[PDB]
A paper describes a structure:
We successfully obtained BV-bound BVR crystals by the co-crystallization screening, and the resulting crystals were a bluish-green colour. The BV-bound crystals belong to a different space group (P21) than those of the apo- and NADP+ soaked forms (P212121), and the asymmetric unit contains four BVR molecules (A to D molecules). Surprisingly, two BV molecules are bound to the catalytic cleft between the two domains, and adopt a stacked configuration along with the tetrapyrrole plane. NADP+ molecules were also bound by all four BVR molecules, although we did not add the NADP+ reagent during the purification and crystallization procedures. One BV (the proximal BV) was bound in close vicinity of the nicotinamide ring, and the other one (the distal BV) was located on the upper stack with the proximal BV. The C10 double bond in the proximal BV, which is to be reduced, faces the nicotinamide C4 carbon (origin of the hydride) of the NADP+; the distance between the C10 carbon of the proximal BV and the C4 carbon of the NADP+ is 2.6 Å, and the angle between the C10 and nicotinamide ring was ∼120°. The distal BV is located ∼4 Å above, translated by ∼2.5 Å to the solvent side and rotated ∼45° relative to the proximal BV.
In this study, we used a cyanobacterial BVR from [name] [name] 6803 (Syn BVR)13 as a target for the structural analyses. BVR catalyses the reduction of the C10 double bond (γ-methene bridge) of BV using NAD(P)H to produce BR, a reaction in which the hydride (H−: a proton and two electrons) is donated by NAD(P)H. Syn BVR is composed of 328 residues and shares more than 20% sequence identity with rat and human BVR proteins. Syn BVR consists of two structural domains (N-terminal and C-terminal domains), with the active sites in an obvious cleft between them.
Author numbering: 9 to 324
Write the structure that this text describes.
C-alpha cells in the first residue's frame, strides 16, 4: 500500500474505477491502456495518468501491484492470465472469461501464484437483488422464476457489445442474469438454451440477439432466463418474477411488490448507488484488512459454467 493500479480499458466501468481509486487513500492509479486515440486521450486528460503502448506493457510494469480489467470481454482471459503470471492482483469486470475452461485455468493459476483473482458482480449489490433476499423467506418454496431483460436499440451500433467475437456468447457476457439465480438457489441440475442472431450486413456484427435459457434447479425450481437486445425489440423489459407457494415477488425495473392471496404490498428497493464504488472498496478492504468479498470467485466461475453450458446447448 498504496495499492498501485493499472487500468485496462477507458469505458464506463473503467472511469468509475479511476474515480474511486484516485480518491481512495489506500490506492494509487498508475497507468492505463485503451483503444481509440480519442478516448485514450480523454481518459488520460480526465484522470491525470499516462497510457501504456500495449496491455502487455501495462501488466508487466513492475510499479503496479494490481491490474484492473475493464475492457472488451474477449480480452479478459489472456490479460488476466498474463497479469497473474507477472505476479499482479487481478480484478475483473464480469465475465471472468468467455469459456468455463479458461476461467478454471485462471482460478488455478491465481491460486498457485498467491494473488487476488476477483470478478466484480454489481448485480449482487443492487437494490433489486437485495430486496429479493430480504423477502425470499416469506414466499415459501420458489417453484417458478423468470428474469427478462430486453434492451431494444434501433439502430444497433457496430460497437464491441454487438460483435460476436469481442462480446462472446450473450449469456456468457450478460453473466449477471444467471448469477442472480445461482446466488439464490444454488446448483443447476439441467440446462436447455436457444440463441438466435440477426446479422448486420457486415455479419461480424449482429443487429439483434435473443438468448433464452431454461434452467432446472436441484431444489425443484424451474427458471427462465430471457436476454434480448437490438433492432427487432420494440418493448423494453427488466422484470424479475418469483413464484413461491406462499407468495409472489415481482420486480419491475427498480419497483417491487409482494403478492399474497391475489393482493399486493409495495416493496422498498434501494438506490442505484455507486455499485462500482462498493466493489472497489470491497477489494481494497479485502487486500488490507482481510474482510471477505461480497461474492466468491467460486460463485463467479460457477455462473460462467452454467452460461458456457448454455453456449453448448446452442451449438455455439
Ligand atoms: N455497468 C457496466 O458497464 C458493466 C457492468 C458489469 C460488467 N461490465 C464489464 O465491462 C467490461 C467493460 O465494459 P463497459 O460497459 O465499460 O464498456 P465500454 O464503455 O464500451 O468500454 C470498453 C473500453 O473498450 C475498449 N475497446 C473497445 N473495443 C476494443 C477493442 N476492439 N479492442 C480493445 N479495446 C477495445 C473501449 O475502446 P474505445 O476507446 O474505442 O472506447 C474502451 O477502452 C465488460 O466486461 C463489461 O461487460 C460492465
Ligand atoms: C447507457 C449505456 C450503457 C452501456 C453501454 C452499458 C454497458 C453495460 N452495462 C452492463 C451491466 C450494468 N450496467 C449497469 C449501470 C450502467 N451501466 C452504464 O454504462 C451506465 C451509464 C449505467 C448506469 C447509469 C448496471 C447496474 C449493470 C448491472 C446489471 C445487472 O444488475 O444485471 C454491462 C454488462 C453486460 C450485461 O449485463 O449486459 C454492460 C456491457 N450500460 C448502459 O446503461
Ligand atoms: C441510451 C440509454 C440507455 C441505453 C442504451 C440503455 C441500454 C443498456 N442498459 C444496459 C444495462 C443497465 N443499465 C441500467 C441503468 C441505467 N442505464 C442508464 O443509461 C441509466 C441512466 C441508468 C440509470 C439507473 C441498468 C439498471 C441496467 C441493468 C441490466 C439490464 O437492464 O440489462 C445495457 C447492457 C450492455 C449491452 O449489452 O450493451 C444496455 C445496452 N439503457 C439506457 O438507459
Amino acid at each position: 500500500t498504496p495499492v498501485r493500479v493499472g487500468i485496462v480499458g477507458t469505458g464506463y466501468a473503467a472511469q468509475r474505477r479511476a474515480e474511486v481509486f484516485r480518491g481512495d487513500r489506500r490506492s494509487q492509479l498508475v497507468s492505463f491502456w485503451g483503444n481509440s486515440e480519442a478516448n485514450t486521450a480523454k481518459f488520460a486528460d480526465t484522470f491525470g495518468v499516462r497510457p501504456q503502448q500495449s496491455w502487455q506493457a501495462l501488466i508487466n510494469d513492475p510499479e503496479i501491484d494490481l491490474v484492473l480489467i475493464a475492457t472488451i470481454n474477449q480480452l479478459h482471459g489472456a490479460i488476466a492470465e498474463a497479469a497473474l503470471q507477472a505476479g499482479k492482483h487481478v480484478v475483473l469486470e464480469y465475465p471472468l472469461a468467455l469459456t468455463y475452461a479458461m476461467g478454471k485455468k485462471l482460478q488455478q493459476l491465481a491460486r498457485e501464484k498467491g494473488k487476488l483473482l476477483h470478478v466484480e458482480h454489481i448485480e449482487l449489490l443492487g437494490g433489486v437483488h437485495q430486496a429479493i433476499r430480504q423477502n425470499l423467506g416469506k414466499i415459501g418454496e420458489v417453484f417458478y422464476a423468470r428474469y427478462s431483460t430486453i434492451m431494444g436499440q434501433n439502430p444497433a451500433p457496430q460497437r464491441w457489445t454487438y460483435h460476436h467475437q469481442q462480446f462472446g456468447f450473450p449469456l456468457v457476457a450478460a453473466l449477471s442474469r444467471i448469477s442472480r439465480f445461482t446466488d439464490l438457489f444454488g446448483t443447476v441440475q439441467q440446462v436447455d438454451a436457444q440463441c438466435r442472431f440477426w446479422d448486420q450486413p457486415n455479419p461480424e456484427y449482429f443487429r439483434a440477439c435473443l438468448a433464452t435459457a431454461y434452467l432446472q434447479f436441484n431444489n425443484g425450481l424451474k427458471a427462465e432466463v430471457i436476454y434480448g437486445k437490438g433492432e427487432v425489440f420494440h418493448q423494453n423489459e427488466r422484470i424479475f418474477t418469483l413464484h413461491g407457494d406462499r407468495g409472489t415477488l415481482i420486480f419491475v425495473g427498480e419497483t417491487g411488490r409482494l403478492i399474497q392471496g391475489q393482493t399486493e404490498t409495495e416493496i422498498t428497493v434501494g438506490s442505484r448507488r455507486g455499485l462500482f464504488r462498493q466493489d472497489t472498496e470491497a477489494v481494497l478492504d479485502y487486500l488490507t484488512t482481510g474482510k471477505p468479498l461480497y461474492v466468491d470467485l467460486e460463485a463467479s466461475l460457477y455462473a460462467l459454467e452454467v452460461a458456457d453450458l448454455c453456449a453448448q446447448a446452442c451449438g455455439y
